Tab-separated table of C-alpha atoms and ligand atoms in Angstrom:
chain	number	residue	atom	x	y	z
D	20	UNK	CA	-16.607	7.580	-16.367
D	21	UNK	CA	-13.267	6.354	-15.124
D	22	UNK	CA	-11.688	7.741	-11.822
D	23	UNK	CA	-8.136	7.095	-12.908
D	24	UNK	CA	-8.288	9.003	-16.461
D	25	UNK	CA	-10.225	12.021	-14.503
D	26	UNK	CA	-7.482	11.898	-11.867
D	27	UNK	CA	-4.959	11.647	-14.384
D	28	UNK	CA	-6.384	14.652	-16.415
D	29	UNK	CA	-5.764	16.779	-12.891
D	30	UNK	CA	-2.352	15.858	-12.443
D	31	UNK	CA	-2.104	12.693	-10.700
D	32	UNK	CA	-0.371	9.597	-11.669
D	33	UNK	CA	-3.212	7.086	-11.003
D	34	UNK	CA	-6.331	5.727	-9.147
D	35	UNK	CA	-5.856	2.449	-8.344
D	36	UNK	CA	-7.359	-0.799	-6.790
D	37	UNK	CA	-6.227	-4.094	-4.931
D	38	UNK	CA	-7.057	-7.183	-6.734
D	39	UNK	CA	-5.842	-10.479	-7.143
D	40	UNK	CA	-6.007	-13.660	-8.778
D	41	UNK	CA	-9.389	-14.813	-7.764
D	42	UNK	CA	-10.737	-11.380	-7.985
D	43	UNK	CA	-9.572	-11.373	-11.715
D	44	UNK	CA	-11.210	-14.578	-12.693
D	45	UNK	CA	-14.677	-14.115	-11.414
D	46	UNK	CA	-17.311	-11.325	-11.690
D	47	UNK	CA	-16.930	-8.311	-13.221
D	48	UNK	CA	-13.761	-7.291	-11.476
D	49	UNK	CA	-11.605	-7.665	-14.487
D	50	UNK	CA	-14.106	-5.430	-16.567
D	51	UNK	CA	-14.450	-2.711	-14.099
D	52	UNK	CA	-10.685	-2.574	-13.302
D	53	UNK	CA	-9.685	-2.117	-17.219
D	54	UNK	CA	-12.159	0.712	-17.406
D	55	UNK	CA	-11.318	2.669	-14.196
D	56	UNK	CA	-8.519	2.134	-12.537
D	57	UNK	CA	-4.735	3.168	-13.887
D	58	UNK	CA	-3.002	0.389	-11.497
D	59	UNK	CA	-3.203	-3.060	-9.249
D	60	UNK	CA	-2.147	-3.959	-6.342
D	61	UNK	CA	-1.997	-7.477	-4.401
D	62	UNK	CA	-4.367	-8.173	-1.610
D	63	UNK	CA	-2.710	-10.911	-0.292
D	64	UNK	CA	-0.459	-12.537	-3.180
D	65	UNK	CA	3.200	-10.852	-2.529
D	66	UNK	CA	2.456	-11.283	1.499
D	67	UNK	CA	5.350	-13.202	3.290
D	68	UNK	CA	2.650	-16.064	3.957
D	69	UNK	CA	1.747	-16.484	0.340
D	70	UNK	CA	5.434	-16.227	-1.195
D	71	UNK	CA	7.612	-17.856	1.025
D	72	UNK	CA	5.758	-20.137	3.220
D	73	UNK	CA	8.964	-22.082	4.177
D	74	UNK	CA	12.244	-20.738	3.390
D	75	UNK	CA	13.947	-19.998	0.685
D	76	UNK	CA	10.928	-22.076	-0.914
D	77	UNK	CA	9.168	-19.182	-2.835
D	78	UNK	CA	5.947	-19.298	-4.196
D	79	UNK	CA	5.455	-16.987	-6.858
D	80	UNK	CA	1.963	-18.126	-8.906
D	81	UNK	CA	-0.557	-15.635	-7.832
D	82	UNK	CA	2.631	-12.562	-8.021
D	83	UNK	CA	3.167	-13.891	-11.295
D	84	UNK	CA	-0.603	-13.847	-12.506
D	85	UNK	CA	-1.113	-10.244	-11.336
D	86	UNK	CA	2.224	-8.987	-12.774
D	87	UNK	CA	0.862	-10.531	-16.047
D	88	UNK	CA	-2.086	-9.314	-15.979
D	89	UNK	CA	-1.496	-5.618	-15.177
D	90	UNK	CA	0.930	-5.589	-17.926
D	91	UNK	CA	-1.333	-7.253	-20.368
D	92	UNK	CA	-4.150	-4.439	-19.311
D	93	UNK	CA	-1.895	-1.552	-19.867
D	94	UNK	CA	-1.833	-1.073	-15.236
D	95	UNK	CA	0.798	0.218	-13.119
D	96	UNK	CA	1.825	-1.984	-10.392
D	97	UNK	CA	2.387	-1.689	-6.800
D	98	UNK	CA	4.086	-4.937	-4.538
D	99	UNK	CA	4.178	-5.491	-1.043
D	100	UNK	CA	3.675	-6.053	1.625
D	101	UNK	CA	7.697	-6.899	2.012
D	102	UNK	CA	8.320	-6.825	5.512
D	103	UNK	CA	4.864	-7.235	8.069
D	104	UNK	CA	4.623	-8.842	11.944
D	105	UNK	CA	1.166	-9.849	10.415
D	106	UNK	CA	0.941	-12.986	7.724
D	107	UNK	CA	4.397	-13.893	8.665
D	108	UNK	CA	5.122	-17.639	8.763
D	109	UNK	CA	6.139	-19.412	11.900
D	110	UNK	CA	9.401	-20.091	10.406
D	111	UNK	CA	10.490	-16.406	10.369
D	112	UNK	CA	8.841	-15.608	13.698
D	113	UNK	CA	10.440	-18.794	15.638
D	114	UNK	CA	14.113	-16.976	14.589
D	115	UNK	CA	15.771	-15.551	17.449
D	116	UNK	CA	19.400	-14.412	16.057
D	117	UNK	CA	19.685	-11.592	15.015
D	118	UNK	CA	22.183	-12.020	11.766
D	119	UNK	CA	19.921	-15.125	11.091
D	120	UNK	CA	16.904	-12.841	10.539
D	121	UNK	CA	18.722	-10.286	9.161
D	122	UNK	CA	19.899	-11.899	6.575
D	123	UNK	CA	16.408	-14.114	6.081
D	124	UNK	CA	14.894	-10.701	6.007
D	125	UNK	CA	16.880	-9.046	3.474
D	126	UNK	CA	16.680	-12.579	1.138
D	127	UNK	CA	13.057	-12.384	1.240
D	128	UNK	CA	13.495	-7.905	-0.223
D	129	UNK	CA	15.970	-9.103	-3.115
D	130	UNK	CA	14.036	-12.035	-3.969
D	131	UNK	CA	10.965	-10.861	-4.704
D	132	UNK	CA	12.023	-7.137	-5.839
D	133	UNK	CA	14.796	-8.703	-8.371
D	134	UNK	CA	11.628	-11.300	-9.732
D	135	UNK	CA	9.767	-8.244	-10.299
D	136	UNK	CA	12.325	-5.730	-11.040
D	137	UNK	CA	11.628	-3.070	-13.096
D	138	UNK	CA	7.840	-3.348	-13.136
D	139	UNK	CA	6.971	-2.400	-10.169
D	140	UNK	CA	6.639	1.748	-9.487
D	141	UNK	CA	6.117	1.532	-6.197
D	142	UNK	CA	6.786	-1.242	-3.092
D	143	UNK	CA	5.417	-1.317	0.609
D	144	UNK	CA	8.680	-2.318	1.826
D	145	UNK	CA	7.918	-2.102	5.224
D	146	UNK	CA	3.833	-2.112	6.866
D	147	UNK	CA	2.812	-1.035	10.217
D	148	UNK	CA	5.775	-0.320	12.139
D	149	UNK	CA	4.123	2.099	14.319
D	150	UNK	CA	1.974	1.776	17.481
D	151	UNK	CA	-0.563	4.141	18.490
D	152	UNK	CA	1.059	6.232	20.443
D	153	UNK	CA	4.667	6.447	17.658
D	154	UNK	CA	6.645	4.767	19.287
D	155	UNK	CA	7.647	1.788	17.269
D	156	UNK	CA	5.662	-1.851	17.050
D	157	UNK	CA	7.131	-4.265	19.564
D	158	UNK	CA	7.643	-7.148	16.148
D	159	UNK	CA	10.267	-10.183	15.250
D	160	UNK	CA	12.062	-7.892	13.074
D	161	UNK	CA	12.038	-4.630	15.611
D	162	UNK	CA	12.524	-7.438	18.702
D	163	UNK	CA	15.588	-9.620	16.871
D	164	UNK	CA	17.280	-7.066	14.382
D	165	UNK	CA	16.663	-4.000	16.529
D	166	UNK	CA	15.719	-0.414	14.999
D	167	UNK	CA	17.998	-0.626	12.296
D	168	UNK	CA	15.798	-3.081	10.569
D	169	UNK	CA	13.552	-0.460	8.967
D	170	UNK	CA	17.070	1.426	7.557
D	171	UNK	CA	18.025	-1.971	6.610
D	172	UNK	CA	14.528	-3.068	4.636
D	173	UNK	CA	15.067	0.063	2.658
D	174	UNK	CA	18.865	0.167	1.108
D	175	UNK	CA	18.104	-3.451	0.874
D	176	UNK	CA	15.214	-2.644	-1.304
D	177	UNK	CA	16.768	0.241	-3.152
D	178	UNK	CA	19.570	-2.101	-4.025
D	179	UNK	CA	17.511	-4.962	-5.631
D	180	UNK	CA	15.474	-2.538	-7.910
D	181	UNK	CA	16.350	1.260	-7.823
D	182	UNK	CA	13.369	2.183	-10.575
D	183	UNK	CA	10.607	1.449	-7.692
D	184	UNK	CA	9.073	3.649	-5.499
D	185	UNK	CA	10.112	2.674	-1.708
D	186	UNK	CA	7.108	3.253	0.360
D	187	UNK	CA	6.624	2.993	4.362
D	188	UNK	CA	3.125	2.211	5.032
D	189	UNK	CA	0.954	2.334	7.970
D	190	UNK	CA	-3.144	3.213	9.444
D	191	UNK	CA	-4.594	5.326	11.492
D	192	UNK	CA	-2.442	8.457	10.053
D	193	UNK	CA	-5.734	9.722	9.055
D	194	UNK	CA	-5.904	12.903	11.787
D	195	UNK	CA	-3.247	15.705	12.427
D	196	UNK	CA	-4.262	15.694	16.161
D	197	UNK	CA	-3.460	11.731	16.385
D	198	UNK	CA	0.306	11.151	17.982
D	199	UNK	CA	0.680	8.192	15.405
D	200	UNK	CA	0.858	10.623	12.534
D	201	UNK	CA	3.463	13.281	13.810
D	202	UNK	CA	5.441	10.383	14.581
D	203	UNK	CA	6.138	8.891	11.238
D	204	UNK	CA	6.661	12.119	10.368
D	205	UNK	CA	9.015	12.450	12.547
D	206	UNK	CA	10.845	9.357	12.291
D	207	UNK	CA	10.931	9.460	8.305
D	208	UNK	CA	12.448	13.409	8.456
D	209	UNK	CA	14.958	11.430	10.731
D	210	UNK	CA	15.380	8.349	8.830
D	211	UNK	CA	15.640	10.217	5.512
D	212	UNK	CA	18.160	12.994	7.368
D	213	UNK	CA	20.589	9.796	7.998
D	214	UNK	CA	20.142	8.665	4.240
D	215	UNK	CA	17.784	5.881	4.270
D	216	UNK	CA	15.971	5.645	0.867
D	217	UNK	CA	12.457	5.854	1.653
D	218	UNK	CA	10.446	7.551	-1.314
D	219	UNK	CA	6.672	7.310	0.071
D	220	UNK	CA	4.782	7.697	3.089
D	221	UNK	CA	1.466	5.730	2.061
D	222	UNK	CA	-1.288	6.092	4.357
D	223	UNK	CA	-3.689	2.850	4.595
D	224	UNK	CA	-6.822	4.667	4.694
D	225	UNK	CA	-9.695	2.657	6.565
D	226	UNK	CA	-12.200	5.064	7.619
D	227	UNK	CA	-15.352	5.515	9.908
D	228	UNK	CA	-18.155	7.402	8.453
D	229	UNK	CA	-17.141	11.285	9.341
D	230	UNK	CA	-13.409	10.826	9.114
D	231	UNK	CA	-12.883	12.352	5.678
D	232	UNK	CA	-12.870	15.391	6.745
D	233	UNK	CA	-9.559	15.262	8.962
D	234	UNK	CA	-7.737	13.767	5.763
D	235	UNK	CA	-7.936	17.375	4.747
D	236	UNK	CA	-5.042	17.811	7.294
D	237	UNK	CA	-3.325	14.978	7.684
D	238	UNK	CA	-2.041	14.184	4.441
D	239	UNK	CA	-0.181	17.225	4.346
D	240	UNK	CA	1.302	16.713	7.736
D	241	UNK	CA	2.396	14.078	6.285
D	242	UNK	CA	3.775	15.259	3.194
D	243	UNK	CA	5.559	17.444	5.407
D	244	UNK	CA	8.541	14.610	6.037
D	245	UNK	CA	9.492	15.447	2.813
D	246	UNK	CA	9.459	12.316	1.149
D	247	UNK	CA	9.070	12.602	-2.796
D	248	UNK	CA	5.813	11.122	-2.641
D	249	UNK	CA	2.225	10.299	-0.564
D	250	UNK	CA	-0.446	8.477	-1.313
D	251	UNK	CA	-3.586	7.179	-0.097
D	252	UNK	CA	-3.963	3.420	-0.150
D	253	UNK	CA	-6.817	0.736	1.111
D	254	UNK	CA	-9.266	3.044	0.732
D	255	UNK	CA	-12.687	2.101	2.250
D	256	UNK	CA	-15.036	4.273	4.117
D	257	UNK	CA	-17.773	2.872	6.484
D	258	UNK	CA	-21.137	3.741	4.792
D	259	UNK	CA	-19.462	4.856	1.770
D	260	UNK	CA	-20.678	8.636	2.441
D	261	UNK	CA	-19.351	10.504	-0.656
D	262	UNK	CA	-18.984	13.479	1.135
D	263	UNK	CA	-16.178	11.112	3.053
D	264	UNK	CA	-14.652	10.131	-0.141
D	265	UNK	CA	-14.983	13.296	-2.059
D	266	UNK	CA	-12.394	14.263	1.303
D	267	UNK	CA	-9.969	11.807	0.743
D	268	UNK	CA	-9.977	12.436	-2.998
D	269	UNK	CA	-9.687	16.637	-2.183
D	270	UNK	CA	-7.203	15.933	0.311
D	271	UNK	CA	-5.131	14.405	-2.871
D	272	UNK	CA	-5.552	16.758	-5.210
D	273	UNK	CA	-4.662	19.210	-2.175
D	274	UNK	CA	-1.275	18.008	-1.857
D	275	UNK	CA	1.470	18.299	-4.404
D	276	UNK	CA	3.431	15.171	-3.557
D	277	UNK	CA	0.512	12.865	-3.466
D	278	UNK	CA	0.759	10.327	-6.235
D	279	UNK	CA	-2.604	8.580	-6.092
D	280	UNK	CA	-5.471	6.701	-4.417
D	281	UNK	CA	-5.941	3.499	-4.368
D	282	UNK	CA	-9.922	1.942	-3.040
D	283	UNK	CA	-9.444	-1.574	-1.260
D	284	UNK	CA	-11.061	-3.633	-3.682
D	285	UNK	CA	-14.080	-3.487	-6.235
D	286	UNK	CA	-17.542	-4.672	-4.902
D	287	UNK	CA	-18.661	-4.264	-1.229
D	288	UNK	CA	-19.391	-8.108	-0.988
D	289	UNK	CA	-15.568	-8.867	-1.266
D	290	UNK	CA	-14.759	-6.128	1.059
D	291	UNK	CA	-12.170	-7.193	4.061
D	292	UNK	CA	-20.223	-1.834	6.116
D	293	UNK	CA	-20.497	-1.575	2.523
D	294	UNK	CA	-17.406	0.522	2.334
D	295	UNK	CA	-16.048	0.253	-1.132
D	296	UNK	CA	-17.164	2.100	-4.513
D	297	UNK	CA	-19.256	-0.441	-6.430
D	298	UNK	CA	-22.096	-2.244	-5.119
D	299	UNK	CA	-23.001	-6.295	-4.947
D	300	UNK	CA	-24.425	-5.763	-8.522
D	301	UNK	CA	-20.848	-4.908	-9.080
D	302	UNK	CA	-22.958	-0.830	-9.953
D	303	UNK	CA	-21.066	2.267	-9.090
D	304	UNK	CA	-21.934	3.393	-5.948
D	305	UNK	CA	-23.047	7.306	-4.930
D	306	UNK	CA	-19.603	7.650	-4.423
D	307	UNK	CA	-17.770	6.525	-6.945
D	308	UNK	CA	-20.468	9.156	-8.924
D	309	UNK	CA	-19.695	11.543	-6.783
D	310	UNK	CA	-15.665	11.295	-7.128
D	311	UNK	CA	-16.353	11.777	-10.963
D	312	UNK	CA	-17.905	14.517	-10.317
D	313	UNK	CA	-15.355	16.029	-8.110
D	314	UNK	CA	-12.459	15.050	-10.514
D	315	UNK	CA	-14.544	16.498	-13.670
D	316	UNK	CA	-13.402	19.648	-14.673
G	6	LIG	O1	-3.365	0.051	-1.829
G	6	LIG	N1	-3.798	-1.220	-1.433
G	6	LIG	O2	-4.937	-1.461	-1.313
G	6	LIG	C1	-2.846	-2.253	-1.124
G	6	LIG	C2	-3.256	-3.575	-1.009
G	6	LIG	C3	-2.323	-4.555	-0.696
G	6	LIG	C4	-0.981	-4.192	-0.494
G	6	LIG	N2	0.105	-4.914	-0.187
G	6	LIG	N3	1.172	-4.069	-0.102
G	6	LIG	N4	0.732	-2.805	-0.364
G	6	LIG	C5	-0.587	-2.875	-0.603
G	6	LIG	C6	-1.527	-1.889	-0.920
């Protein structure tokens, strides 16, 4: 059975999967992603690294293949990530002015949302802005441009493609006790409240066996920013215990503004603790069986 028609038959818009180019060409990957899951998103292949490794010299081949194929497939598709202090060329972290990266910066948004526009529901426009403790990650961007960057990333973004989804990203916003989660929270209600266009909180989801359970209450904390929309995204779960993913998926379904789930690749082999769905026989796992289950009605 397929996780993204069951979710879809409760409500949801989709369950979905990261992929790319290599994934799609080997295996079973293709296979298993046309049955079960509703939309794709890149691994690596819309990274700063991978599409703009020197300036204003874009590389768009791997983008391009995934677009294609998602379309071709009948999948939703989700881009990013547009702004990151990780995979970021030297180029972009050797700039020291702040119009300079500013306007590098804001380039790199149009570019690649105005190649993609209107196909895309939803972008990561900006990843991992937060440290652990909320306040906000010491990067280029935060260091150069100052805290108007992540205001700036976003009506830059809105601009180049208004049809997408503008999503702030970031882990560890898996427990309601945690300061890191308040704190987007916090700064989103605050960022919104000044009119900065961010549609999604999505939570990057990387779990150690047990830690299900305090999805339950985070996700609606942070729901509770008010954005339009939540989602869970790079699912994986150390040990793959269904009763942690049958949280996660609950924790969904318990929240009115979350869109979807999307599991951090296909087979545990290619995982980034055989934490994904499918096994190295590319066979459903105990807990993909046991998210049908829970999505059956
Ligand atoms: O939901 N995802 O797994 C996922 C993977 C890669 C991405 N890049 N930007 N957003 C992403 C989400």
């Amino acid at each position: 059975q397929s996780v993204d028609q069951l979710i879809k038959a409760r409500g949801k818009v989709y369950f979905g999967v990261a992929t790319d180019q290599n994934r799609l060409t080997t295996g079973k990957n293709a296979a298993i992603i046309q049955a079960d899951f509703g939309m794709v998103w890149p691994e690596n292949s819309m990274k700063w690294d991978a599409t703009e490794p020197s300036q204003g010299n874009f590389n768009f081949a791997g983008a391009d293949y995934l677009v294609n194929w998602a379309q071709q497939n009948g999948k939703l598709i989700g881009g990013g990530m547009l702004v990151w202090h990780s995979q970021l060329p030297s180029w972009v972290s050797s700039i020291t002015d702040k119009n300079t990266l500013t306007n590098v910066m804001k380039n790199h948004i149009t570019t690649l949302m105005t190649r993609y526009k209107g196909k895309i529901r939803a972008w990561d426009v900006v990843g991992e802005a937060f440290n652990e403790d909320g306040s906000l990650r010491q990067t280029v961007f935060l260091n150069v441009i100052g805290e108007d960057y992540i205001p700036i990333a976003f009506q830059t973004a809105r601009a180049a493609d208004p049809n997408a989804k503008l999503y702030i990203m970031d882990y560890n916003l898996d427990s309601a006790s945690y300061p890191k989660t308040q704190a987007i929270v916090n700064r989103v209600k605050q960022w919104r409240a000044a009119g900065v266009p961010i549609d999604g909180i999505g939570s990057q989801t990387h779990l150690s066996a047990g830690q299900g359970a305090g999805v339950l209450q985070a996700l609606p904390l942070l729901a509770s920013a008010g954005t339009p929309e939540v989602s869970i995204l790079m699912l994986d779960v150390a040990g793959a215990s269904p009763t942690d993913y049958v949280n996660v998926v609950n924790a969904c379904l318990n929240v009115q503004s979350c869109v979807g789930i999307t599991v951090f690749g296909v087979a545990d082999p290619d995982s980034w603790t055989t934490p994904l769905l499918f096994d190295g026989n590319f066979n459903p796992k105990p807990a993909y069986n046991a998210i049908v289950q829970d999505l059956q009605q």
